[PDB]
Enzyme design. Structure first.
Site, mmCIF file in Angstrom:
data_model
loop_
_atom_site.group_PDB
_atom_site.id
_atom_site.type_symbol
_atom_site.label_atom_id
_atom_site.label_comp_id
_atom_site.label_asym_id
_atom_site.label_seq_id
_atom_site.Cartn_x
_atom_site.Cartn_y
_atom_site.Cartn_z
ATOM 1 N N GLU A 34 24.524 19.284 -0.486
ATOM 2 C CA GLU A 34 24.325 20.654 -1.024
ATOM 3 C C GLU A 34 24.636 20.835 -2.510
ATOM 4 O O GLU A 34 25.128 21.889 -2.937
ATOM 5 C CB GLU A 34 25.128 21.678 -0.217
ATOM 6 C CG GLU A 34 24.756 21.734 1.245
ATOM 7 C CD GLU A 34 25.005 23.093 1.869
ATOM 8 O OE1 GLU A 34 26.052 23.244 2.525
ATOM 9 O OE2 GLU A 34 24.166 24.005 1.695
ATOM 10 N N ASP A 51 38.100 8.548 12.004
ATOM 11 C CA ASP A 51 37.003 7.804 11.369
ATOM 12 C C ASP A 51 37.554 6.902 10.261
ATOM 13 O O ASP A 51 36.943 6.749 9.196
ATOM 14 C CB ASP A 51 35.943 8.783 10.837
ATOM 15 C CG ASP A 51 34.624 8.104 10.465
ATOM 16 O OD1 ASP A 51 34.128 7.242 11.226
ATOM 17 O OD2 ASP A 51 34.072 8.450 9.396
ATOM 18 N N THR A 73 26.894 19.196 -4.299
ATOM 19 C CA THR A 73 28.251 18.822 -4.660
ATOM 20 C C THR A 73 28.179 17.618 -5.591
ATOM 21 O O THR A 73 27.302 16.761 -5.440
ATOM 22 C CB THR A 73 29.089 18.453 -3.421
ATOM 23 O OG1 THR A 73 29.059 19.533 -2.479
ATOM 24 C CG2 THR A 73 30.535 18.161 -3.808
ATOM 25 N N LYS A 79 38.230 3.785 8.258
ATOM 26 C CA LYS A 79 37.351 2.645 8.013
ATOM 27 C C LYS A 79 37.578 2.148 6.579
ATOM 28 O O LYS A 79 38.307 2.791 5.819
ATOM 29 C CB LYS A 79 35.889 3.067 8.253
ATOM 30 C CG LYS A 79 35.399 4.230 7.397
ATOM 31 C CD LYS A 79 34.215 4.957 8.021
ATOM 32 C CE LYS A 79 33.546 5.878 7.012
ATOM 33 N NZ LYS A 79 32.670 6.909 7.633
ATOM 34 N N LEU A 119 42.477 10.078 -8.123
ATOM 35 C CA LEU A 119 41.381 9.177 -8.472
ATOM 36 C C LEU A 119 41.619 7.765 -7.950
ATOM 37 O O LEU A 119 42.708 7.230 -8.099
ATOM 38 C CB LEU A 119 41.242 9.132 -9.998
ATOM 39 C CG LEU A 119 40.101 8.326 -10.619
ATOM 40 C CD1 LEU A 119 38.757 8.951 -10.289
ATOM 41 C CD2 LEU A 119 40.284 8.240 -12.126
HETATM 42 CL CL1 LIG Z 1 32.282 9.414 -6.172
HETATM 43 C C1 LIG Z 1 33.972 9.059 -6.330
HETATM 44 C C2 LIG Z 1 34.446 8.035 -7.171
HETATM 45 C C3 LIG Z 1 35.813 7.782 -7.273
HETATM 46 N N1 LIG Z 1 36.379 6.783 -8.073
HETATM 47 C C4 LIG Z 1 35.620 5.986 -9.047
HETATM 48 C C5 LIG Z 1 34.820 4.889 -8.340
HETATM 49 C C6 LIG Z 1 35.033 3.435 -8.771
HETATM 50 C C7 LIG Z 1 35.572 3.926 -7.421
HETATM 51 C C8 LIG Z 1 36.692 8.583 -6.500
HETATM 52 N N2 LIG Z 1 38.006 8.593 -6.377
HETATM 53 C C9 LIG Z 1 38.362 9.546 -5.524
HETATM 54 C C10 LIG Z 1 37.224 10.179 -5.070
HETATM 55 C C11 LIG Z 1 37.149 11.293 -4.093
HETATM 56 C C12 LIG Z 1 38.188 11.439 -3.142
HETATM 57 C C13 LIG Z 1 38.189 12.428 -2.211
HETATM 58 C C14 LIG Z 1 37.123 13.355 -2.172
HETATM 59 N N3 LIG Z 1 36.839 14.401 -1.424
HETATM 60 N N4 LIG Z 1 35.624 14.942 -1.852
HETATM 61 C C15 LIG Z 1 35.136 14.239 -2.880
HETATM 62 C C16 LIG Z 1 36.024 13.217 -3.145
HETATM 63 C C17 LIG Z 1 36.070 12.169 -4.089
HETATM 64 N N5 LIG Z 1 36.175 9.564 -5.694
HETATM 65 N N6 LIG Z 1 34.799 9.778 -5.630
#
Ligand SMILES: Clc1cc(NCC2CC2)c2ncc(-c3ccc4n[nH]cc4c3)n2n1
Length: 387
Positions: A21, A117, A23, A119, A73
């Site tokens: 949607e 879930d 996001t 994984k 992150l």
């Molecule tokens: Cl696309 C993304 C990328 C992340 N790191 C950088 C990539 C090299 C790995 C990353 N780190 C935490 C999250 C994250 C965590 C929980 C979430 N809930 N809804 C959305 C969420 C997103 N992401 N997402």
């Protein structure tokens, strides 16, 4: 370019991924932290419970259209940690990773939350902290790599996540026992460097329904593999009610340091010193014990330890008890031993304990099972979980 929304900033060019949607996830900042910033249309209709190995949702802010959510992150998923060629561990070894994952899960279960879930796609490896250290953290959203972008979803069975279906689908509302099964599968996945304990993907579900697991990468005469097998088999037990709780998994020998392994042996030996050879404890201990001891343990140790022991007519070579007594004797008198004996055994505790577990790969597993009889006792409460 930069967008400021309250305490959250980000650069619109720094896209990490897309979700449903419209996001979107950006890289950004909140309170001098590097964060993922999720921008969403708002949907209609606890800081005091945070834990290092569960992902943090730091803050939500809003403009006139969107909500922006600051999220802890990650550098990579566990899928990437395990699968990617030449992936730098950066000081985070597999057992520790699994230890941390199980702690986050025990925490979630302590709050009556079931993941459902769990994984490789939603166990996330952190960015290195101020102290140069990384950790595993369980996320509700799983990430699937697609250049420098990742899809994120909370849903089970989305493209990329096909061989990891929610255990409830292969069967009462979900209990902790589904998470333990999944954890058990993750344990094997990491340890085997990418295999699933229920086989290749086209036969995997069928295998799970029948409990047909194959832990082929675990060697039956290697101490570390004997211990890991013992645990993993309990975690993925076909019967949900025989699966151990997360806190129970945390007490398992799989996670014990070499010092703790040696202390366990020392303690059981102390416990069985005055025990009669025909009592229930020593009987449990000697049952199946000939294989554990390789028939005669005195013929399977080094020549210098063999020679030092010859005086001790007491120690029987068929006996598991006496091997443990010999071990406790030489640990206690280590200082006073001949130079050649201290040399063959090596240093306390790490070389010493490995001298025995390498030669007798079933000793700890067998002693751990046998000594469950004394699990409620005060001395053994450090080694066993009680209900
Ligand atoms: Cl696309 C993304 C990328 C992340 N790191 C950088 C990539 C090299 C790995 C990353 N780190 C935490 C999250 C994250 C965590 C929980 C979430 N809930 N809804 C959305 C969420 C997103 N992401 N997402």
């Amino acid at each position: 370019s930069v967008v400021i929304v309250g305490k959250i900033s980000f650069c619109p060019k720094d896209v990490l991924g897309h979700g449903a949607e419209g996001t979107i996830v950006y890289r950004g900042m909140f309170d001098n932290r590097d964060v993922a910033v999720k921008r969403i249309l708002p949907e209609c209709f606890r800081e005091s419970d945070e834990h290092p190995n569960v992902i943090r949702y730091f803050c939500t802010e809003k403009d006139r259209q969107f909500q922006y959510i600051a999220i802890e992150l990650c550098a990579a998923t566990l899928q990437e940690y395990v699968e990617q060629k030449d992936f730098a561990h950066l000081g985070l070894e597999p057992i520790t990773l699994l230890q941390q994952t199980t702690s986050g899960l025990a925490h979630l279960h302590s709050l009556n939350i079931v993941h459902r879930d769990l994984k490789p796609h939603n166990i996330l490896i952190s960015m290195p902290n101020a102290h140069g250290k990384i950790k595993a953290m369980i996320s509700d959203f799983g990430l699937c790599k697609k250049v420098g972008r990742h899809s994120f979803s909370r849903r089970s069975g989305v493209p990329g996540t096909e061989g990891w279906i929610a255990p409830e689908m292969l069967s009462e509302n979900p209990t902790y026992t589904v998470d333990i099964f999944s954890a058990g599968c993750v344990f094997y996945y990491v340890i085997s460097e990418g295999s699933h304990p229920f086989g290749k993907s086209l036969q995997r579900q069928a295998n799970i329904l029948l409990g047909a697991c194959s832990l082929d990468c675990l060697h039956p005469e290697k101490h570390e593999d004997v211990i890991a097998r013992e645990l993993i088999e309990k975690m993925i037990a076909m019967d949900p009610q025989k699966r151990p709780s997360a806190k129970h998994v945390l007490k398992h020998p799989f996670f014990w340091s070499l010092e703790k392994q040696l202390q366990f042996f020392q303690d059981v030996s102390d416990r069985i010193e005055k025990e009669s050879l025909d009592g229930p404890i020593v009987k449990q201990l000697e049952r199946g014990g000939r294989a554990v001891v390789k028939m005669d343990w005195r013929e399977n140790i080094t020549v210098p330890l063999q020679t030092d022991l010859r005086k001790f007519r007491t120690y029987k070579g068929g006996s598991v008890r006496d091997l443990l007594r010999a071990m406790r004797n030489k640990k206690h008198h280590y200082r006073e031993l001949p130079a050649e004996v201290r040399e063959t055994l090596g240093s306390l505790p790490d070389d010493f304990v490995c001298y025995f577990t390498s030669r007798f790969p079933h000793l700890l597993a067998h002693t751990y099972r046998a000594m469950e009889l004394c699990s409620h006792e005060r001395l053994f409460q450090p080694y066993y979980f009680h209900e």
